[PDB]
């Protein structure tokens, strides 16, 4: 049970660290009527506009605190349908909620600390070619990873992985 669980910890960090798409809400979740839905539906919308391939199916993970505010947001509403009352008798938010094939509560999602970096400007003009490889040193051809790219800034201070 311990070795199986340490595996879970690494997918929690690895996804939170390399995640590109960023949805930032100025206010604490659950402080407004639909904001718990708008916070999820923003995600299903952006990767639709961005033309991603979801054909394998999508997923969303709340942390235990925001999963509580997803139900707390849905319980305020005066009339009880089957969705509002299901939230009440159990804390369950429905399994889909605006387009994701499933929605879960994962306890081990890490916190992302703020960064103190300010006043950063890029250095000169910079362009990145979609190369499959490049020459180096002796001239032998070396693979290039599509994902990563190197940007030169004015200073790196307070920035972190």
Partner 1 sequence: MALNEGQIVTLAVDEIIETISAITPMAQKAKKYTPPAASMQRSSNTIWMPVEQE
Partner 2 sequence: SPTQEGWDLTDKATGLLELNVAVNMGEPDNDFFQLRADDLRDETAYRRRIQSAA
Residue 3 in contact with partner 1, rule: CB under 8 A? no
Secondary structure string (H, E, C) spanning 124-153: CCCCCCCCCEEECCCCCEEECCCCCCCCCE
Closest contact distance (angstroms) between CB of 5 and partner 2 is 9
Count Cα neighbours of 9 within 13 Å in the Cβ-side half-sphere. 6
Binding partner at 72 among partner 1, partner 2, a second copy, none, C-beta below 5 to 8 Å by kind = a second copy
Closest CB to partner 2 among 1 and 147? 1
Stretch that binds partner 1, among 24-32, 53-61, 71-79, 148-156 (CB under 8 A): 53-61
Give all strands (DSSP E) within the chain, no chain letters: 60-62, 103-105, 133-135, 141-143
CA distance 114 to 79: 39
Residue 43 sits at φ, ψ, to 5 deg, of -75, -45
Q: Is 88 helix (H, G, I), strand (E, B) or coil?
A: helix
Number of Cβ within a 10 Å radius of residue 96: 13
The contacts of residue 115 (CB under 8 Å, 6+ apart) are 158, 159, 160
Closest CB to partner 1 among 55 and 78? 55
Binding partner at 160 among partner 2, partner 1, a second copy, none, C-beta below 5 to 8 Å by kind = none
Closest contact distance (angstroms) between CB of 86 and partner 2 is 38
Residue 125 in contact with partner 2, rule: CB under 8 A? no
Name which position in 5, 116, 121, 137 contacts partner 1 (CB under 8 A).
5
Residues within window 1-20 making contact with partner 2, judged by CB under 8 A: 2-3, 6
Contact positions toward partner 1, by CB under 8 A?
A: 1, 4-5, 7-8, 11-12, 15, 51-55, 59, 61, 104-107, 143, 146
List residues near partner 2 by CB under 8 A: 2-3, 6
């Amino acid at each position: 049970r311990k070795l199986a669980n340490n595996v879970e910890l690494k997918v929690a960090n690895m996804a939170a660290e390399m995640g590109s798409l960023v949805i930032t809400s100025p206010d604490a979740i659950g402080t407004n009527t639909a904001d718990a839905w708008n916070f999820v539906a923003d995600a299903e919308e952006i990767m639709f506009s961005r033309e991603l391939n979801r054909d394998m199916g999508t997923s969303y993970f709340f942390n235990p605190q925001d999963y509580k505010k997803a139900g707390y947001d849905l319980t305020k509403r005066d009339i009880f349908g089957r969705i509002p009352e299901e939230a009440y008798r159990d804390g369950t938010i429905q399994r889909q909620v605006a387009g994701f094939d499933d929605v879960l509560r994962s306890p081990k999602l890490p916190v992302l600390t703020k960064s103190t970096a300010t006043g950063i400007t890029v250095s000169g003009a910079q362009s990145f070619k979609p190369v499959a490889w490049q020459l180096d040193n002796d001239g032998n051809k070396v693979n290039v990873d599509n994902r990563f790219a190197t940007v030169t800034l004015s200073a790196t201070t307070g920035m972190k992985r």
